[PDB]
Subunit: 89 residues, 3 copies
């Protein structure tokens, strides 16, 4: 049908990350002030949400990717993506 | 085809809240630094969005729950979830 | 099944903006501490996400509107809504 997106941003440049769920895959587009590019995030999902927070100026991102009733948390903490501890139960 | 989520976070710990719409009901999973647990929020909806802000250490949360063309705003201001003033028109 | 919403907020009032995709159109409801009102944003879309950031006391808003596989970014920078440079991967 139509794709589904989620977005987050931080600072004042700003940095923006836009996640798109399309045909069962979530990909990431990124803005850091100098043109859009494709990010490192690539995981399966039919639905995506995101949140982020700063510690000082350092960004932490959590992406919630869902297929059917299964949601997986993906974590950015300054050195790549890792699977997080989030569960339903 | 999947559940639909929304997420918010605050502070540096951080705290995180993830809302999931599934089979016409929205439920809440919570992180305050010491493991995921099930939150108090439980209301009807097929779609959810969220935003939040701090007043000191006190979180204020607004959840927008949609069923058909009706969106209800649910408010956390320190003492349970209450309906907010939000309307379509 | 239901309308779909996206929300952002800023400052200490706070100000809130809620975008709703309904029947192929996205509209905007606004809170600046003094009651809900209808905003100027009105554009086509079946799905919506949003983020925002402050530069001094000035809000900047980015709304990601999707129709099929095409996502259009709409930009508020103090002087009306304009189309942004965002493109898909
Ligand atoms: C903090 C920041 O802005 N960092 C960006 C780089 O990353 C992007 O922003 C992150 C916050 C996050 O959203 C991420 O998904 C974004 O991609 C940004 O992109 C990197 O560019 C380099 C080249 O300049 C690489 O392409 C890198 O890709 C890989 C890598 O090859 O190293 C892919 C790999 O799969 C991935 N592995 C994992 C487990 O995550 C790694 C890993 O993320 C990084 O090595 C960790 O540092 O990345 C891109 O991630 C870059 C654009 O030049 O600018 C900032 O550095
Ligand atoms: C301010 C805060 O962090 N409070 C939590 C409690 O509420 C959760 O967080 C708030 C912000 C909101 O998301 C709620 O929906 C969450 O449940 C949290 O749960 C409360 O626990 C008591 C049991 O003593 C009652 O069941 C309430 O109904 C719950 O709201 C507790 C759990 O340890 O942690 C913090 O106090
Ligand atoms: C900065 C601001 O709040 N401007 C208000 C006007 O625009 C509204 O808010 C901006 C950020 C954007 O969301 C617009 O689409 C939205 O209409 C608003 O029209 C006016 C009406 O009272 O009040 C301004 O303060
Ligand atoms: C903030 C926390 O960061 C990591 O430890 C994750 O494993 C948790 O699920 C949570 O996101
Ligand atoms: C923050 C940036 O603002 C404008 O430059 C837009 O054209 C970009 O797409 C981006 O949103
Ligand atoms: C920030 C405001 O809080 C109030 O209590 C609510 O009634 C409004 O709708 C809005 O969410």
């Amino acid at each position: 049908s139509s794709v589904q997106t989620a977005a987050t941003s931080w600072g004042t440049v700003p940095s923006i990350r836009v996640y798109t769920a399309n045909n069962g895959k979530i990909t990431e587009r990124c803005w850091d002030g100098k043109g859009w590019y494709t990010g490192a995030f690539n995981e399966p999902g039919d639905n995506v949400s995101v949140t982020s927070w700063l510690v000082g100026s350092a960004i932490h991102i959590r992406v919630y990717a869902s297929t059917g009733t299964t949601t997986t948390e993906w974590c950015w903490d300054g050195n790549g993506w890792t699977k997080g501890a989030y569960t339903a139960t």
